[PDB]
Amino acid sequence: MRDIKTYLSVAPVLSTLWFGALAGLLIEINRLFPDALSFPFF
């Protein structure tokens, strides 16, 4: 079990999941704010 944990902590899979989460966040932001060119908050 702990072996599969140390394997999961190997940079490829960690990086893939991290990048997937980041891309999901970005595409969701783009969905909720289409075309988002300026900073119309301040």
């Binding site: 902590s9 940079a11 960690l14 289409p34 075309d35 060119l37 900073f39 119309p40």
Partner: protein
């Protein structure tokens, strides 16, 4: 009106671009059933680009002589919703990332062969080091104050 660039809340070529875009979209729309989900998504994108044109006509966007937005990064905070605030926001993010990475590495340096933890991250230590980003401006600050950020004549080895 910087160098004569009128905002397309008032210019015309912007309206012409908007009109032609919605026109070609609508002409494409009338080749299906008025209820087909593809036609529905087409009308959705139509109103979406329409409200985009509207939003652009709400935030002082000085607008070119050809019907296109044009940023004004000259420093005047009047047009700052393009560079200054997003610039400092991204600088905050980048400082976050740089500081957290540097701190992780400085920490994990003290082991037997740090390469084994540089290829396979100490995800526990990584998790209890990562959220420190809120300190990256101030912390590094004190470092430079105490001179614990740079080195003088230690170059190779460590």
């Amino acid at each position: 009106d910087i160098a004569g660039l009128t905002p397309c809340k008032e210019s015309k070529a912007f309206a012409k671009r908007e009109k032609q875009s919605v026109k070609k979209l609508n002409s494409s729309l009338k080749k299906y059933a008025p209820d087909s989900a593809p036609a529905l998504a087409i009308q959705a994108t139509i109103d979406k680009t329409k409200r985009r044109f509207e939003n652009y006509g709400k935030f002082g966007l000085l607008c070119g002589s050809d019907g296109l937005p044009h940023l004004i990064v000259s420093g005047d905070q009047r047009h700052w919703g393009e560079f200054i605030t997003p610039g400092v926001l991204f600088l905050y993010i980048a400082g976050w990332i740089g500081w957290v990475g540097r701190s992780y590495l400085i920490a994990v340096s003290g082991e037997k062969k740090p390469a084994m933890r540089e290829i396979i991250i100490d995800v526990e230590l990584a998790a209890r080091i990562i959220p420190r980003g809120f300190i990256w401006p101030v912390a590094a600050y004190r470092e430079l104050i105490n001179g614990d950020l740079v080195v003088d004549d230690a170059d190779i080895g460590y």
